[PDB]
Design an enzyme around this catalytic site. Structure first.
Site, short mmCIF file in Angstrom:
data_model
loop_
_atom_site.label_atom_id
_atom_site.label_comp_id
_atom_site.label_asym_id
_atom_site.label_seq_id
_atom_site.Cartn_x
_atom_site.Cartn_y
_atom_site.Cartn_z
N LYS A 80 0.77 -1.03 -0.04
CA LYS A 80 0.29 -0.20 0.25
C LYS A 80 1.00 1.57 -0.19
CE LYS A 80 -4.14 -2.89 -0.01
NZ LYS A 80 -4.35 -2.40 0.73
C1 LIG Z 1 -4.96 -4.42 1.06
C2 LIG Z 1 -4.14 -5.59 1.88
C3 LIG Z 1 -4.18 -6.41 0.67
C4 LIG Z 1 -5.18 -6.43 -0.62
O1 LIG Z 1 -4.77 -5.35 -1.72
P1 LIG Z 1 -4.91 -4.46 -2.60
O2 LIG Z 1 -5.11 -3.21 -2.82
O3 LIG Z 1 -7.32 -4.79 -2.02
O4 LIG Z 1 -4.56 -5.65 -3.66
C5 LIG Z 1 -3.52 -7.86 0.81
N1 LIG Z 1 -3.07 -8.32 2.50
C6 LIG Z 1 -2.57 -7.20 2.91
C7 LIG Z 1 -2.20 -7.35 4.32
C8 LIG Z 1 -3.08 -5.74 2.85
O5 LIG Z 1 -3.21 -4.87 3.89
#
Ligand SMILES: *Cc1c(COP(=O)(O)O)cnc(C)c1O
Ligand SMILES: *Cc1c(COP(=O)(O)O)cnc(C)c1O
Lengths: 471, 474
Positions: B51
């Site tokens: 992210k």
């Molecule tokens: C945000 C997140 C994801 C998946 O995020 P997307 O933007 O929907 O691909 C997967 N694992 C963790 C630990 C996350 O914080």
């Protein structure tokens, strides 16, 4: 662009190093530092520590001379990072790991090398190296008693300084374009500072090299600096020892800076706050040493400092403000603890409940009522929230309706399924600071968990309203 | 070579991304997977999460459109990683951070977001998205109640998918040289999978796109895959939701794989054990989904899987075997817990003390005896170690450390014993198994038996004694 990682990597060992160099402009502005404080973020490696390089290097040197075959066992004394590096190398190339480390070191390191399949023997913290129970002594004993055992002895292995001399110092030279004025390194086994300082003074002799040694160790010169605190244990882990290792060339360093645990930890917290680098305590020690040493410099010239390991090894140890309070360490100049101490002061929830005028009491239910009867009571009593008695939790009308529509809440089902289970027990005597801290983990805070005759719930929005009433 | 980091970086935001791709040969060999399993180690970014990219880029879009000025406040609902990314962006570029996250999420995320100076309000875990107490609803309320506050809404912000469409998928394509057959992505907000799947389907239409969502979410298609656990809470953090986010284009993904908590965590620990990647649980879920989806593939083709976040956010949560035992999850085929269960079994310390032969009571001291008297008694009794009393139990003392501290100028002869004693110790009882004392020895150097009938300790136990016991067996 993409030169080192544009390709495909065969293993995690091929992802060690190549750590970026970041400019700490914000921290320099905070502390009033004129020069450019550069940080070699060695904690961003695959193993999250600078020891990944020396671990991979010792393993490659052993395999290059035929001194190591598959199935052999590796024993290594470490403060935690060299153990992780060697455990990674062993899990990759198929070696057995047995680690000896002092009990003072954090439990995160032990759990991490346990996840890597390394047997961990712990040694007493107060034991000197000469003792029968030193991590190096227990390492030697395990080497003697075990078959096909090997010790690479990072305290004396030539790979440790030579590789910081070969790749790390060359990395910082290439990225700083040769112009380096001051180099601040933490002193552990000393291979890092030896190699880096030697390689940079070869191609940039005008650069000054200052070493960081924690209060308690005897690595600084002369001993007049150590006499402040001789052979006394320190909470910082990774730097300082009670003996000069074979790889430490004390003649390479120009200055020495003694740093305590409080300064190191508050500087690490300041790094995390102002720069956004999840670093360890030794990184704070090195940065405080740099702030003490590079004050004579001006703009233009650059002072590089190492960040050995990340916050992962000390997540529950020194990031948590509770452990800082138990040790009485100044958390930070700008942080949430002091902000709350300033804004809330001695205010307790009695004052808030009295200034609000909440002479009302939230209704109660037997925690086994049906959804039909609880909906009837919620609609007839005109109140929104309800707390289920005995604690089980809280229940709001919005969640009731939405879960009933979501196919999770049948009318004949018990309330326990649709209730909010997260709660924090408080009492009117508690200050606003402590309830604001408890709200970091629990959404609601219920009071009066005398008799079960509580008045209502308190949340963060009510604290912001209280902050809006005053001032 | 050195292309992306050969220079100096102005801030930490310029150090996120550029994550290398590693081949998980050992894990594939362990699980019997013929094809090449590629792992996009997104957890090695500066913030330790995927992210970071979307946070940096949403802030860049806000600043580029003049919708954001210095001093403003930033609010964002997150599972913990987007909050960290935006907190880093705010701490660097001078913005205020307020985070809303469910209580289910780990405490390490909360503590680290407190370290960036962000206000953190929690929401009930069982709360649906329609509730006014959900993280998104509470974020909207805070925006309504606060001045100069903004929500970037990673669930609906088109930066989230378009960044993985622009940079991340381009990274994957450049690292795989275009040849990619399968790509497995965890389904949270859906931005990463949408972006990467679209960009790869544009340049490599032969590539399949498989989505991973935890058992409990409703993001899979069709709904017949959710009926296993309809809207049931799960322990894995980061993936799955009770609604389709605005950025998730479910038409981009071909296959869907459901993964439970136990499988996800067991595969995460197996990754850590066999490959050496300090990674999080959602990555274990993704890797199990990949192992179940790419089973039909053959040698040569490449199946790419993303590992969103690192073990730092779950350091005390799922790395520790105690919590996984509290939730009854199979740790791993090869691990220390099962290894000790196999090697030791139901053996207790009484069996070890009987097979070696103790028949003795270790010497005892008042823990305030002078070094003169303690050395006199130790030489007169011929013993090596001694146990010191209260000044509960204080610890152990050996003649080696006595002499070495005396000559070191740290042990005066008139000094009290408590100065030279070992303060790390573990209390045990004869009925304790060998596995629990072996676990406790991972944190304490010594283990003393029968502390607090009568205070009659029988001996001290170390790891070398357990190895000697294993030497009497085969
Ligand atoms: C945000 C997140 C994801 C998946 O995020 P997307 O933007 O929907 O691909 C997967 N694992 C963790 C630990 C996350 O914080
Ligand atoms: C290894 C290490 C250092 C640096 O030690 P050197 O012997 O100089 O390489 C600093 N801090 C920590 C936490 C370490 O583990």
């Amino acid at each position: 662009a993409d030169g080192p990682y544009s390709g495909i990597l065969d293993s995690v060992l091929d992802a060690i190093g190549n750590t970026p160099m970041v400019r700490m402009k914000r921290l320099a502005k905070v502390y009033g530092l004129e020069c450019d404080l550069l940080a070699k973020c060695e904690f961003m490696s695959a193993g999250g520590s600078v020891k990944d390089r020396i671990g991979k290097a010792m393993v490659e040197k052993a395999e290059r001379e035929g001194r190591l075959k598959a199935g052999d066992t590796l024993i290594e004394p470490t403060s935690g990072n060299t153990g992780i590096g060697l455990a990674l190398a062993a899990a990759v190339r198929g070696y057995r790991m047995i680690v000896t480390m002092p009990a003072k070191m954090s439990a995160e390191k032990s759990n991490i090398m346990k996840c890597l399949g390394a047997e961990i023997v712990r040694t007493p913290t107060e034991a000197a190296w000469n003792d029968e129970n030193s991590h190096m002594g227990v390492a030697a004993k395990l080497q003697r008693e075990l078959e096909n055992a090997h010790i690479l002895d990072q305290y004396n292995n030539t790979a440790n300084p030579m590789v910081h001399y070969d790749v790390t110092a060359e990395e910082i030279i290439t990225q700083c374009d040769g112009d380096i004025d001051m180099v601040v390194i933490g002193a552990g086994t000393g291979g890092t500072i030896t190699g880096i300082g030697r390689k940079i003074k070869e191609r940039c002799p005008k650069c000054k090299v200052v070493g960081v040694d924690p209060k308690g160790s005897i690595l600084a010169v002369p001993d007049s600096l150590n006499d402040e605190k001789r052979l006394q244990s320190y909470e910082v882990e990774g730097i300082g020892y009670d003996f000069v290792p074979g790889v430490l060339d004390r003649k390479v360093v120009d200055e020495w800076v003694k740093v305590g645990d409080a300064e190191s930890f508050t500087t690490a917290r300041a790094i995390i706050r102002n720069e956004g680098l999840f670093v360890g305590g030794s990184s704070g020690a090195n940065v405080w040493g740099a702030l003490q040493a590079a004050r004579q410099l001006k703009k233009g010239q650059k002072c590089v400092v190492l960040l050995p390991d990340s916050s992962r090894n000390y997540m529950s140890k020194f990031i948590s403000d509770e452990w800082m309070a138990e040790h009485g360490f100044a958390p930070e100049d700008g942080a949430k603890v002091k902000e709350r101490e300033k804004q809330f002061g001695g205010a307790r929830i009695r004052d808030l409940l009295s200034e609000t005028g909440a002479t009302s009491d939230v209704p109660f239910v037997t925690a086994r009522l049906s959804v039909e009867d609880v909906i009837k009571m919620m609609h007839e009593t005109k109140v929104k929230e309800v707390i289920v008695t005995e604690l089980v939790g809280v229940l709001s009308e919005d969640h009731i309706a939405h879960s009933l529509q979501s196919g999770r809440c049948a009318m004949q089902s018990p309330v326990k399924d649709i209730a909010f289970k997260k709660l924090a027990k408080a009492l009117p005597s508690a200050y606003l600071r402590d309830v604001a801290k408890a709200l970091d983990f629990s959404p609601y805070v219920c009071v009066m968990d005398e008799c079960p005759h509580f008045l209502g719930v308190i949340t963060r929005i009510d604290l912001l309203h209280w902050l809006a009433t005053k001032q």
